[PDB]
Amino acid sequence: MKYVVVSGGVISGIGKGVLASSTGMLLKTLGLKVTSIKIDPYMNIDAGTMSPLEHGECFVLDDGGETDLDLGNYERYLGITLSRDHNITTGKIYSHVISRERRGDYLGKTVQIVPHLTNAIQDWIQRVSKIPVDDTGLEPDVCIIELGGTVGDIESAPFVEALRQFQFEVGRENFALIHVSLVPVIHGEQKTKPTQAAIKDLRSLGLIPDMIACRCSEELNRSTIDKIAMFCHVGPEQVVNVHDVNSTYHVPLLLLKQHMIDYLHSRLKLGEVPLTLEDKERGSQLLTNWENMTKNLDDSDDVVKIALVGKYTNLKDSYLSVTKSLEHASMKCRRQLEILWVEASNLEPETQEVDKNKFHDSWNKLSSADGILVPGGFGTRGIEGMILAAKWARESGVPFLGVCLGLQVAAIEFARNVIGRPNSSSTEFLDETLLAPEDQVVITMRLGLRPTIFQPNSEWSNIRKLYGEVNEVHERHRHRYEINPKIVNDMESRGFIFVGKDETGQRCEIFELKGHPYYVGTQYHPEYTSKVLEPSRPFWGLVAAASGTLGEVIKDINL
Amino acid sequence: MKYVVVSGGVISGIGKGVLASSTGMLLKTLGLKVTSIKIDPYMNIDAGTMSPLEHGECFVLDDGGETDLDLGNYERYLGITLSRDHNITTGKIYSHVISRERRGDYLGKTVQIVPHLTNAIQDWIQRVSKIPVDDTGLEPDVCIIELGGTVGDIESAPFVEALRQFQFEVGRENFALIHVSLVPVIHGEQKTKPTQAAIKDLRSLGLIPDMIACRCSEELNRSTIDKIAMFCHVGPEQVVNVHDVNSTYHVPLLLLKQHMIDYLHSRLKLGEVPLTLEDKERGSQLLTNWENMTKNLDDSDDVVKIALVGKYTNLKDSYLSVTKSLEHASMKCRRQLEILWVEASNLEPETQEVDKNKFHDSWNKLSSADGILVPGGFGTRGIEGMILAAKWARESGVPFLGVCLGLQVAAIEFARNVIGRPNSSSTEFLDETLLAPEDQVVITMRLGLRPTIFQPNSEWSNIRKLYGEVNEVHERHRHRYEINPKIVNDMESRGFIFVGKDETGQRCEIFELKGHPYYVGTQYHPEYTSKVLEPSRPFWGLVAAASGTLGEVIKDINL
Amino acid sequence: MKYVVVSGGVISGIGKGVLASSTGMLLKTLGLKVTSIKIDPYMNIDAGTMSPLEHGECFVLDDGGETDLDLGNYERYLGITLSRDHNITTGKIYSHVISRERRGDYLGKTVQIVPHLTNAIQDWIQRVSKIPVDDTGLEPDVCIIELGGTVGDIESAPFVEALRQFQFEVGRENFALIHVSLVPVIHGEQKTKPTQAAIKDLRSLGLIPDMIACRCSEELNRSTIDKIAMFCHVGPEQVVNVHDVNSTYHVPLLLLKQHMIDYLHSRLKLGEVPLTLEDKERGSQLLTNWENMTKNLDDSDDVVKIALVGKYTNLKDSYLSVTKSLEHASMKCRRQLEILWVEASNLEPETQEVDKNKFHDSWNKLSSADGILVPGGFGTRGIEGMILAAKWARESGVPFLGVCLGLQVAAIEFARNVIGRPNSSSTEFLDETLLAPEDQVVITMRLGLRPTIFQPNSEWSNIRKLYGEVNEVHERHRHRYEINPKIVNDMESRGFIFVGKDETGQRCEIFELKGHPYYVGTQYHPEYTSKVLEPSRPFWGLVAAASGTLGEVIKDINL
């Protein structure tokens, strides 16, 4: 087992998550089996309790774990499945040793942060990195650890102490440290004192960096490389840079151009790892596929515009799996994507009195779009604006996908306007008044990977054709509210077909509307099962439908 | 409310606990109401799970809290009652904020060590210092906080960060810092660089010391004072020393000789605290009583020897409340005390084969003693040796006190040798063989302050006369095993009278033997209710009985 | 825009102001945006010139408008902000059309009460009801107009004529009339001829009532309802009653029990007003919060007593915002309130010669109280009595709040007795003698919403913790006199800390005294920013401090 810590810097926004995911995928090009662990200094047990306004969305695993967003970067670059154990936190590990001290496994000893908590962290990392995470039976060859927060924040102290010990409690040449660090530019001169201070803060904790990975708005000067490589122990080829490029898929090839594998191939002795003839082929094949999708982003120009309608769209981190799911679906179509970020509340007619500027801009953006997405996220702000987007998309025949809350919004819209029930509404917020036209109801969560069964007549639907006309689908759920199953037959008779349901019925999971080119919704989040070469099927439907060629996509999928 | 932090140094053994207790009692000489809080960086919720081989005994509060030993130093110097809340720990406060984050009181925010855990520590200190701790109704004027561990140990980090904030979240002139620090002597020269480094480690965390309290084997030189007072912000009178004197009761008067009150009277503005005419009298009266008991230790010479028989007596911290209870009882008698530390196992005849030196020395020490104590502490090592000490004390008519296990050992001894049941024994360790002559049985703990009722005939006993012939007694329990109540009438008929029991009966709490000058035992720990001017009654009995004058002590108590 | 006139009756004391405020809040439970306008037949431009001995206190708006007291009932029930335009008067509107006729906008026409003044009233009501009054950007859906004085008083004539026209100059189903009327009981029989005469006086002016709201000391008999509903056009459900209950917060639920919303929901066609899904939730949520605070007044019993010390306390209308601010603060604590009304002059030692009865009763009341308030109000009567209450509260350690004059009285008290300047005094009344120990000085008014900045060291204070430790506070001022800033450093050195000041300094706005559980004063009136669910912070401090639990209140506010 090899370990690669990706760590620290001078700021919390530095973009470690891209570099960790990219470093792991580059190791996967050698054919190595790879896994990864995110460490969070926060005291929350999970990202589930904490609101999307901080650290972006929670990400859902097959376990039903509501983990930190960074686990999604690993799953979609590395192709692996992660467990709720792969997101370590301060909350998890203090809860673990405190529950263990009350149970008494420490034999009446005094329990202390060193050695007992730092040995508990090292036991967690040793257990969790040996969980098999590919579909194959094998234990991973390499583990990427991403150390969240910044080095020398008091929040991090047990993890920087544990990782010092770990560099010896596992062999050297089985452990290596990448430090990620800020190189700000002032008056056009590339200033280095922030990264020199961060390299000292690592040495103060006994962590010694094997590569320094600069984050900068420029190519590093050869003087900027030398002034760091002379201050730190790293050689000139071990001062990595990652530029402020928009395409995060280019980062693996920007690291490969900087010869970063050729250092780790020595520094971790990756030639001593045994590999089969299948492994080297499936490794090199994966690199050629990534050269092709990045070539397609360099030379595809013909924009498809998708409008994304939701709360707090200024927090673009709040929708990162949607963004990445749309980008995978646009690459599969060989088309460039624009996302138009529509703050759903500004669509509402009260905005035309309160701030007439925001009203006209938000309705410009929505009218402009070749297809529409309603992305999910609980909370009562802007839902009539999201209902207005679903209405516009139904009436103007514009491709629509509704994910989680977006499906319920389309059901409420179709009830208010096509069934003509003018006060039909979500149970989430009006039930203090005990309303009879319930569109949502409660059914304390439904979470993680679940089976959807396609209902027997559904063979006609574009969405069931996108799932290869298979009878069942596996996707990740997260909801407490679902469509009222008393009203379902009214919608299924008026043409809004609930194409798929849970095994028990009375719990709707996919709809497609008869008489529209692509108007679809899902109760699950299709984003989380997206992979770079195999996009999320409902999103491959939406981004093909917006472009045209949805028939040719379905004809392809029938091979 | 005023706060006085006592803190840190270069080593964990430095003796903060004496200085905190002494500083608080000196503030009590002004008539101020005083309280105190111990902070422990360990992850244990309580000292109850952890074995006496580390940090000495657990101390029992009236709550039944098995707290850190340092709470006992506060109760016996300050005269206060502490709650299980007055011992803060890493385990307590991480358990508190983690349970609070799962309950969700933090409104979906990300929870972090700063500000959320440091604000939870500051809320704990603010709540707990306002608990009334004297017998009177009033809230305390001053709180002493003792910061356990050492400054810049990673274990301490949330508490040194919290206390920086606290210096502002409560006013300056309502908070002050005492730093306690090591001044080692090499070649007879008093070296200062360890304390200069500890003063820098405080400044690095933003904590600024108002007094530096040196711990040294000498009087500080005036150069040793100046070389510290020139390096640090403290004036010459704010460099305190506490010498390696044996009598810890002299420390309050050694601080008073160094004019330490006259600094805090300015630095905490203690003249602005309102005080009544009763308060100043009961304050100054308390100082004169302490001048008298310390004068008596300077001029009493006529030694009483008590042998203390138990496990691990090399760990003299394991019996600190016994030691202090014996010292209070010897001072009340105006007699000097020697304790003879007898490792109970060495009394056993197997020792005479294994190491004949340890056998003869341990039996020398036991034969030498004017009275005998068997102190408690669970675990099967040496119990036949403790039975042999109880036998010797019964047969030779030598004063005996058995506390907790020491009472059960005397019951087992009296059963084996006076009732003549040769295999009668503790249920604690032989019950894998299901023995019928059970002396102990289980009755998951009995803990904290409980009532003992004296059984109706008991008026004759020296122990009930020592409790003023009152019908009931309040003392602190800690046990899972008690005397088999089926066998009690056999002992009460053979003369081993169970003088006191729980309200329900079938649970024995005090015995006295008919036909011995003072042979007594208690199921409770009488040590924990000892106070400097009012010693523990069973121990005032033992140390009077060893000296003679037990009648005159009882005649006094009848006033 | 909908209008609801609340009007008239047989007497000026009838309690329209409660019914208007309650009717508006009930409309706010539907989620409608609401506003209100008070009409006063008096010739004063504002309530600022007129003394508190008539129509109670003046109320201060954010504008600095010294408006009629009834505007405060609207702000505290409806949650809205009012402008100096929302109090219409005879003085305002005759000043408006006379200044407009001298300017000549009437093009040389003869100007007459009809149509020109009645059209000016209708233009005022149309302009002012469309001012946005919530924190949100929206124009109000409903306006409550309260017609002051009584119908057919000659003082009212232009307003009853204007409102007849207004019923057509705005649509019917956009205007409705509530008439409030007296139903006296004689020999236990509920006499109706006063209200029959008041209903005729409305018809004589062409105003037709849509509901009759009886004010009576009983439940109306069903015969009393029928004998009114047969004489007037109103149906049986449109004869409202409001009982002489003490809790004015119960009136909204007594109107809701009488189904009064279900009439206005038809009669104003409030189902035709568009509402969003947020609006209906924030509407129904507000009703549940009001059910809870009224449930708490039904089942809280554990009295806190506050003594209110001031001039003319027999005029309990003179302190209505203080009373309501104390009631909001007691409800937030879940405790019942008694106010003890202490006429401040009777505390003075001259009273013990003049009327020894009034002396002993006033000092009984002040000694009895768990906390003390000095409420403001200019004029030289009783100020030494208010100084004696401030003295008593400082010395006996009893919670104290001084508002406006009450802060200056506490500064004068602390100067006379703790600084020991025996003749230090207000500049307001002794300056004919040109005294050097000035405690007040003049600094022609300071009025309306202003910023207070907390001075840098103030983090310790209970008052700054009650304001959430925010650096700035927004509250309503009204004063010509302030603390002499030459003497401020003497008080700040002796412990009376001026915790907050104006942006410029030299103008003190909050004090808290070091060394008292809660002794505070404000130059602003904290009463006017009180709201039913969010009490005034200095008053939430006082009423918590009197009860105990001031720490737990501050711990709560830190969430």
Ligand SMILES: Nc1ncnc2c1ncn2[C@@H]1O[C@H](COP(=O)(O)OP(=O)(O)OP(=O)(O)O)[C@@H](O)[C@H]1O
């Ligand atoms: N080299 C990079 N190139 C482009 N974008 C980057 C780069 N580094 C960081 N970012 C961007 O900055 C944001 C944060 O990056 P990332 O998640 O990898 O940082 P992080 O250190 O893991 O932050 P966090 O601790 O919050 O998870 C993301 O939007 C990411 O795409």
Ligand SMILES: Nc1ncnc2c1ncn2[C@@H]1O[C@H](COP(=O)(O)OP(=O)(O)OP(=O)(O)O)[C@@H](O)[C@H]1O
């Ligand atoms: N000034 C002193 N004079 C005499 N003995 C001292 C002094 N300082 C410390 N000691 C002794 O050293 C031991 C530890 O002292 P103390 O309990 O006060 O230290 P501490 O800092 O509180 O240690 P801990 O953190 O383990 O509780 C005790 O036996 C105590 O009596």
Ligand SMILES: Nc1ncnc2c1ncn2[C@@H]1O[C@H](COP(=O)(O)OP(=O)(O)OP(=O)(O)O)[C@@H](O)[C@H]1O
């Ligand atoms: N229904 C009621 N229940 C309880 N108290 C009432 C009621 N109606 C009036 N009052 C009380 O009578 C006094 C005057 O009431 P209110 O201010 O509402 O009358 P008003 O018609 O507006 O008088 P004004 O014209 O002087 O403003 C207040 O103390 C008020 O609390």
Ligand SMILES: O=c1ccn([C@H]2O[C@@H](COP(=O)(O)OP(=O)(O)OP(=O)(O)O)[C@@H](O)[C@H]2O)c(=O)[nH]1
């Ligand atoms: O204003 C002054 C005065 C003096 N100095 C002095 O400090 C020295 C250290 O040089 P710098 O502080 O400029 O550091 P650096 O260029 O090595 O590092 P970067 O942060 O640019 O990566 C010398 O340059 C000396 O003149 C300054 O740097 N700045």
Ligand SMILES: O=c1ccn([C@H]2O[C@@H](COP(=O)(O)OP(=O)(O)OP(=O)(O)O)[C@@H](O)[C@H]2O)c(=O)[nH]1
């Ligand atoms: O062996 C050597 C050589 C050089 N130095 C040098 O270091 C200097 C600092 O002096 P010290 O290191 O002796 O420190 P100090 O006496 O101030 O502190 P204490 O630890 O005794 O309290 C000077 O004395 C200089 O000669 C040594 O201290 N020791």
Ligand SMILES: O=c1ccn([C@H]2O[C@@H](COP(=O)(O)OP(=O)(O)OP(=O)(O)O)[C@@H](O)[C@H]2O)c(=O)[nH]1
């Ligand atoms: O003393 C007399 C004599 C005659 N009347 C006469 O006047 C009549 C009108 O009856 P009332 O004047 O009693 O009026 P009312 O009962 O309808 O109204 P309230 O004021 O009680 O609501 C009849 O009752 C007739 O006898 C009196 O009312 N009172």
Ligand SMILES: [Mg+2]
């Ligand atoms: Mg941040």
Ligand SMILES: [Mg+2]
């Ligand atoms: Mg990240």
Ligand SMILES: [Mg+2]
């Ligand atoms: Mg140790």
Ligand SMILES: [Mg+2]
């Ligand atoms: Mg200690």
Ligand SMILES: [Mg+2]
């Ligand atoms: Mg009047």
Ligand SMILES: [Mg+2]
């Ligand atoms: Mg009124």
